[PDB]
Amino acid sequence: ILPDSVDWREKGCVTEVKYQGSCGASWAFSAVGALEAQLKLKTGKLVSLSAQNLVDCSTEKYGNKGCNGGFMTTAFQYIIDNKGIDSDASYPYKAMDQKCQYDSKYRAATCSKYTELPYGREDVLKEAVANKGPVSVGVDARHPSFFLYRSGVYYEPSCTQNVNHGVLVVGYGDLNGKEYWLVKNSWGHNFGEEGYIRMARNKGNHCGIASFPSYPEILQGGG
């Protein structure tokens, strides 16, 4: 059976909330967040990964445009191809497009593979959050109510399943019966609940939370 509630912050799998600023690189933050959890699960160490490394290096060849958008799946593919990603400390975030400055000397994580989940399947997303860890997702975050979100379970009747902002699902639960997905955003700690947004769960793919989910993996050999 799946636990009724999950919070990956309780297992020390979630780094501090980041502030993307005037750079449309939510995709890079969503991708690093998911891999940070895997790095902790596999080694026991929590280290922030370089979103800047994705912005500057996972570019045209990955269908990404740095500060003008991108995708978590192709960000994972770049990490696979590159044989690593630098730590955030070694390659810091500047909220702007720069020349690729990857340095294998400061590589903090690898990626073996990535898995995409079926569209709108909140049951499959719940299973992946429980058994695999934090899942990279897109959400419809265009509505004034998302921008004005302070606390509780976010429900927007005007929300669509067409995603426009990359976030990280780090858990799930319920607020006195109102089911939610625990979401890590990249708008700093002053957004919502210390940088988190709890979004309506099992409400017909509310805001397209389960439209395009993906998660990376770090494999330990094989048999």
Ligand X SMILES: C[C@H]1COCCN1CCCn1nc(-c2ccc(Cl)c(C#Cc3ccc(Cl)c(CNCc4ccccc4)c3)c2)c2c1CCN(C(=O)C(N)=O)C2
Based on the shown chain and the rule CB under 6 A, indicate whether residue 204 belongs to the binding site for ligand X: no
Residues 81-140 that bind ligand X (CB under 6 A): 138
Q: Which residue, 61 or 83, has its beta carbon nearer to ligand X?
A: 61
d(CA 215, CA 133): 8
**Region from 39-47, 66-74, 126-134, 170-178 binding ligand X, contact rule CB under 6 A:** 66-74
Question: In this structure, are residues 181 and 173 in contact, taking their beta carbons and an 8 Å threshold?
Answer: no
**Region from 36-44, 69-77, 82-90, 122-130 binding ligand X, contact rule CB under 6 A:** 69-77
Q: Where are the beta strands (DSSP E) in 60-211?
A: 85-86, 107-109, 113-116, 135-139, 153-154, 165-175, 178-184, 196-200
Q: How many CB atoms lie within 10 A of CB 155?
A: 14
For ligand X (CB under 6 A), the number of binding residues is 18
Work out how close the CB of 102 gets to ligand X at its nearest, in angstroms, rounded to a whole number: 20
Residues 150-169 that bind ligand X (CB under 6 A): 162-166
From 20, 50, 185, 211, residue interacting with ligand X (rule: CB under 6 A): 211
Q: How far is CA 87 from each of CA 1, 9, 113, 171, rounded to the nearest angstrom?
A: 36, 19, 19, 24
